[PDB]
């Protein structure tokens, strides 16, 4: 064994770090990363007193945290601390990783004419939709587009598949 | 708001018992305060007595930090060498002389006095103060021994 680990929170347990009370600072675990920009979901456990049963209780809770470098992943165990809300549902940020979790970088490194198809299909529906149904609801503004493009692209791919057909039917008729 | 020192009541009907509090001027005088400082109990009992209590260590905070008493408290704090006395209505340097002060009521204090032997009480006091002198003159012969 060694001697210099004796304050590392891993060998030490989580006891060594001294956290402020009242939800100022906390200990927890990340659940999501990369699904949104500069945000990570986190889980924490509480322990308070309940006198009628004369035993502590527990409570899980979820928070959303501000990560500036998009640096953390799920298993990374991390301290978080209170900040004023820069946005809704974000009043916490990260202070420090206590225990890391390995990354997926070594595996990530290994991992055009349609742009004239795409830009038409957009302009198709904005001319139709705006006349038929106005802005009224954002749900309609989004549920259409995401559901209309696949209806459009398999029709716009079909517009370009004709190009391979027309050019060759000339050469077949011009050659022979 | 500004900070004020003034009274506040806790005593009941026909039995006043005031307090001293550091509170601002805008809140309910019967409400909250920032620091209980002192008392003002005028009545007597076998246990409680007629008092003016204060905590100098905190009156010297708020006055040093921004505060101002009322008229009564300015009087009560005069005797603690923190403030001056408030001025009389018509004014000092004009008071006329009055007859001498006399005690009306002895307040119902019962120090050690013997009952049903009123005639001979003067004898009791000689015998008690003679013994003062004896132990004095007789405590000397120990001090030589030590």
């Amino acid at each position: 064994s060694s001697v210099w680990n004796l304050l590392n929170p891993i060998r030490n347990g989580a006891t060594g770090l001294k956290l402020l009370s009242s939800g100022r600072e906390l200990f927890g675990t990340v659940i999501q990363h990369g699904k949104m920009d500069k945000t990570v979901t986190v889980k924490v456990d509480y322990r308070y007193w309940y006198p009628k049963t004369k035993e502590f209780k527990s409570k899980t809770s979820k928070y959303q945290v501000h990560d500036s470098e998009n640096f953390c992943v799920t298993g990374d165990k991390v301290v978080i601390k209170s900040m004023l809300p820069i946005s809704t549902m974000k009043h916490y940020y990260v202070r420090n990783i206590v225990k890391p979790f390995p990354r997926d970088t070594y595996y990530k490194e290994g991992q055009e004419q349609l742009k004239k198809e795409y830009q038409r299909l957009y302009q198709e529906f904005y001319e139709r939709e705006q006349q038929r149904t106005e802005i009224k609801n954002k749900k309609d503004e989004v549920t259409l587009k995401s559901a209309l493009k696949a209806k459009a692209l398999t029709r716009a791919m079909a517009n370009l598949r004709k190009v391979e057909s027309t050019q060759k039917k000339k050469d077949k008729v011009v050659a022979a | 708001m500004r900070v004020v020192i003034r009274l506040q009541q806790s005593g009941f009907k026909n039995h006043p018992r005031w307090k001293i509090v550091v509170m601002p001027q805008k809140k309910n005088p019967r409400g909250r305060f920032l620091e209980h400082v002192g008392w003002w109990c005028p009545r007597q009992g076998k246990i409680n007595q007629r008092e003016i209590v204060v905590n100098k260590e905190r009156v010297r905070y708020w006055i040093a930090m921004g505060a101002k008493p009322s008229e009564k408290v300015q009087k009560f704090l005069s005797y603690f060498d923190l403030a001056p006395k408030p001025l009389i209505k018509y004014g000092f340097k004009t008071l006329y002389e009055k007859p001498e002060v006399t005690p009306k009521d002895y307040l119902n204090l019962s120090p050690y006095k013997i009952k049903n032997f009123d005639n001979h009480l003067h004898e009791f006091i000689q015998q008690e103060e003679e013994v003062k002198f004896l132990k004095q003159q007789r405590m000397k012969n120990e001090l030589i021994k030590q």
Binding site: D45, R47, Y48 | -
Partner: protein
Amino acid sequence: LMTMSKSGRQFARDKPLEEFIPKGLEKLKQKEQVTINTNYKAGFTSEELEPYNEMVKRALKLNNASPFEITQFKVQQAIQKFKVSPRDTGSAAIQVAVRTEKLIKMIKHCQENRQDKYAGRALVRLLEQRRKWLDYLRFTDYHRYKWICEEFCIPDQPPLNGHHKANFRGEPNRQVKTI
């Protein structure tokens, strides 16, 4: 069993998780036929058999074997790859591989014999038990988790709990009750 359910509760509309990547089953089935056509039984090698005659080889050949024997080769074929120490048999990397070879059989057994209700309950256990060792192995040797899921055509979906309760859960924070 485990479903996409970000809250504490588990609904009806929530969908089960994905066992395989798209077209994961068929790729594995193709690998077997390649083995079945060119391999012998588990214990035996081609080098040991070259003096002996063909009639001895065709018997030992794995075409003629039973599916209970077809796995035994595939298992030991995996153990030589995904072991930690020699004569390893029970470590997590192998235990997941065993269930993947069973799922190939249970589905074939259940697609065909649909009324074997006892089997329909047995899938739900294999998946769940696979879903545990598949998680416990992420946590310990993450760079072996990925070297498995590629071979067996498995998706890389982390757990929604975030490995919270097994790893380094401690000192759970203080609050107070009132009223």
